[PDB]
Amino acid sequence: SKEKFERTKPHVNVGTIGHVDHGKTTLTAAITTVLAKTYGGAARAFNQIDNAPEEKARGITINTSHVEYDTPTRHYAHVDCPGHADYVKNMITGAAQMDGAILVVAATDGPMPQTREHILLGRQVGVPYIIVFLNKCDMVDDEELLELVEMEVRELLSQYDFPGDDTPIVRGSALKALEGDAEWEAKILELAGFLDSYIPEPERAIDKPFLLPIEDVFSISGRGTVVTGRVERGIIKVGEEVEIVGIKETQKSTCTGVEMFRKLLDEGRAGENVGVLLRGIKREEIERGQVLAKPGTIKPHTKFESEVYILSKDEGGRHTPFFKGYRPQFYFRTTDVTGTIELPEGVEMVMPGDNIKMVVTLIHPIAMDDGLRFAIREGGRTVGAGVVAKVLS
RNA sequence: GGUUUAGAACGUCGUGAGACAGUUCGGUCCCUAUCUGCCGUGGGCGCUGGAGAACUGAGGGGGGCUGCUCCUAGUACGAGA
Ligand SMILES: Nc1nc2c(ncn2[C@@H]2O[C@H](COP(=O)(O)OP(=O)(O)NP(=O)(O)O)[C@@H](O)[C@H]2O)c(=O)[nH]1
Ligand SMILES: [Mg+2]
Ligand SMILES: [Mg+2]
Ligand SMILES: [Mg+2]
Ligand SMILES: [Mg+2]
Ligand SMILES: [Mg+2]
Ligand SMILES: [Mg+2]
Ligand SMILES: [Mg+2]
Ligand SMILES: [Mg+2]
Ligand SMILES: [Mg+2]
Ligand SMILES: [Mg+2]
Ligand SMILES: [Mg+2]
Ligand SMILES: [Mg+2]
Ligand SMILES: [Mg+2]
Ligand SMILES: [Mg+2]
Ligand SMILES: [Mg+2]
Ligand SMILES: [Mg+2]
Ligand SMILES: [Mg+2]
Ligand SMILES: [Mg+2]
Ligand SMILES: [Mg+2]
Ligand SMILES: [Mg+2]
Ligand SMILES: [Mg+2]
Ligand SMILES: [Mg+2]
Ligand SMILES: [Mg+2]
Ligand SMILES: [Mg+2]
Ligand SMILES: [Mg+2]
Ligand SMILES: [Mg+2]
Ligand SMILES: [Mg+2]
Ligand SMILES: [Mg+2]
Numbered sequence: 001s002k003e004k005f006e007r008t009k010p011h012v013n014v015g016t017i018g019h020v021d022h023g024k025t026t027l028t029a030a031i032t033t034v035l036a037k038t039y040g041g042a043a044r045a046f047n048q049i050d051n052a053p054e055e056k057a058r059g060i061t062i063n064t065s066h067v068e069y070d071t072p073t074r075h076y077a078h079v080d081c082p083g084h085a086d087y088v089k090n091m092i093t094g095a096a097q098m099d100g101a102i103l104v105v106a107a108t109d110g111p112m113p114q115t116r117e118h119i120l121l122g123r124q125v126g127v128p129y130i131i132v133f134l135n136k137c138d139m140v141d142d143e144e145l146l147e148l149v150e151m152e153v154r155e156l157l158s159q160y161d162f163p164g165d166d167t168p169i170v171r172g173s174a175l176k177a178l179e180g181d182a183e184w185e186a187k188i189l190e191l192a193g194f195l196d197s198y199i200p201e202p203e204r205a206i207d208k209p210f211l212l213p214i215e216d217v218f219s220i221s222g223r224g225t226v227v228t229g230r231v232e233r234g235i236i237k238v239g240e241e242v243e244i245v246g247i248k249e250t251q252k253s254t255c256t257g258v259e260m261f262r263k264l265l266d267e268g269r270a271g272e273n274v275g276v277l278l279r280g281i282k283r284e285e286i287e288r289g290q291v292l293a294k295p296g297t298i299k300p301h302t303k304f305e306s307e308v309y310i311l312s313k314d315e316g317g318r319h320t321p322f323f324k325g326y327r328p329q330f331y332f333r334t335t336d337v338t339g340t341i342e343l344p345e346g347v348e349m350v351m352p353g354d355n356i357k358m359v360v361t362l363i364h365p366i367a368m369d370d371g372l373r374f375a376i377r378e379g380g381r382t383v384g385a386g387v388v389a390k391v392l393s
Numbered sequence: 394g395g396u397u398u399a400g401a402a403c404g405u406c407g408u409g410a411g412a413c414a415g416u417u418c419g420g421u422c423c424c425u426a427u428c429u430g431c432c433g434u435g436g437g438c439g440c441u442g443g444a445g446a447a448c449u450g451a452g453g454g455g456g457g458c459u460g461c462u463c464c465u466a467g468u469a470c471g472a473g474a
Contacts, residue, residue, distance in 0.1 A: 020473065059467080060474090085473060113472050139468095 018104030023135030246290030289335030312353030
């Protein structure tokens with residue numbers, strides 16, 4: 001909080017995806033040290049990508065850590081997702097804001113059960129583009145074995161509905177590029193080139209009014225309570241009226257400073273992760289899931305009609321019917337929420353792999369409008385995608 | 394210290410003397426080692442002229458415990474932990 005962030009180069013939200021203990025967080029650390037050395041950005045280290053007691057005694061990552069590496073063309077903003085099956089909830093918030101992912105499959109183990117689950121969540125939420133990275137390579141010195149894994153990833157993406165063969169696969173060790181090997185340093189400089197070439201300039205919405213889903217809340221010692229997240233649409237000027245909408249009720253507020261990776265800003269534009277400082281609000285009363293909207297634009301609702309597309313055994317979801325009373329998790333912009341289902345008159349049961357509409361009464365009210373996309377989940381797996389039809393409350 | 398003498402008391406049984414793995418407080422533990430054994434340490438003669446050294450080894454004894462950390466490797470194993 002001192003240096004002013006100069007608005008140059010387009011902003012892009014990137015993040016690593018993949019199996020547990022597969023080189024996902026280590027890739028993030030490899031991208032910093034490579035890009036910082038040659039081009040001349042800020043250095044950083046593997047340290048702080050994940051500190052705490054939880055991510056040291058174990059070694060695993062829980063929190064979605066962020067990184068800011070810069071290149072001549074564009075200014076990237078990383079989102080290193082956790083990895084585990086148990087940490088899928090806080091991952092989806094990191095994955096929703098992420099524009100273009102970096103998948104991490106390993107040459108030794110290959111595509112594992114979570115790799116299938118992570119890419120499954122990427123499609124239904126909103127991950128337009130994806131890039132593969134083989135994160136072991138050196139451990140198995142062979143030409144035939146390493147190339148057989150590349151075939152299975154191309155099959156995985158094409159089976160689950162992506163381009164597959166068009167996606168640029170890259171090979172390279174993360175640990176070898178951490179130190180200073182000339183052949184392996186240049187091979188991850190190549191990944192930065194694939195990030196620029198494949199993923200296009202993202203289409204923002206700098207016209208329709210201000211909205212910002214809160215991914216994680218903070219309490220800065222001195223300044224006040226702060227909320228982070230990607231600005232979904234519109235802009236934010238300093239000293240402007242902002243209404244916080246979502247869970248509990250609704251509160252008036254005013255912005256008193258927006259920032260971008262510990263650097264000041266005047267205008268917080270759309271499609272970029274920013275930390276908004278709020279005036280006269282406590283850490284407890286504001287929570288994760290709520291949205292920073294401009295007053296009057298959006299209203300919180302606890303009941304709505306919605307066209308739900310349930311999945312089958314083949315697509316990956318439920319395989320049995322269910323009657324009114326069923327309570328799955330509904331993942332809107334960031335947070336999840338439970339709700340009872342009231343089916344329409346003339347529909348006795350809901351079979352798997354079927355398009356229908358239904359009334360859903362949620363326990364917590366969330367801010368929503370007509371034409372909002374969500375992904376239903378229940379029992380550590382997906383259920384179905386859909387869209388909102390009508391407001392009731 | 395306990396049990397198991399002589400003092401005294403409580404509860405209990407007994408008319409009473411007294412009694413009770415019922416309880417309670419107090420209450421002398423001797424022996425210079427002949428033999429066997431054992432740990433040490435010598436004198437005698439023997440071993441075939443005597444003497445001084447240096448070995449050999451039959452045989453005997455002693456010694457044999459194990460933690461943690463770190464690499465191999467967060468590798469096999471495992472959906473993950
Ligand atoms: N030899 C070698 N080891 C690697 C390479 N990349 C990653 N690893 C190893 O893979 C392990 C996993 O590290 P990390 O990336 O933090 O795990 P993750 O992929 O983020 N998943 P999670 O954080 O949920 O546990 C580490 O022990 C690391 O040494 C590589 O290129 N070569
Ligand atoms: Mg492993
Ligand atoms: Mg990780
Ligand atoms: Mg393995
Ligand atoms: Mg006594
Ligand atoms: Mg006695
Ligand atoms: Mg007496
Ligand atoms: Mg007696
Ligand atoms: Mg008694
Ligand atoms: Mg006395
Ligand atoms: Mg005495
Ligand atoms: Mg005495
Ligand atoms: Mg004497
Ligand atoms: Mg003897
Ligand atoms: Mg002797
Ligand atoms: Mg002799
Ligand atoms: Mg003699
Ligand atoms: Mg003689
Ligand atoms: Mg002799
Ligand atoms: Mg002779
Ligand atoms: Mg002789
Ligand atoms: Mg002699
Ligand atoms: Mg000798
Ligand atoms: Mg000798
Ligand atoms: Mg012995
Ligand atoms: Mg180790
Ligand atoms: Mg582990
Ligand atoms: Mg290893
Ligand atoms: Mg297996």
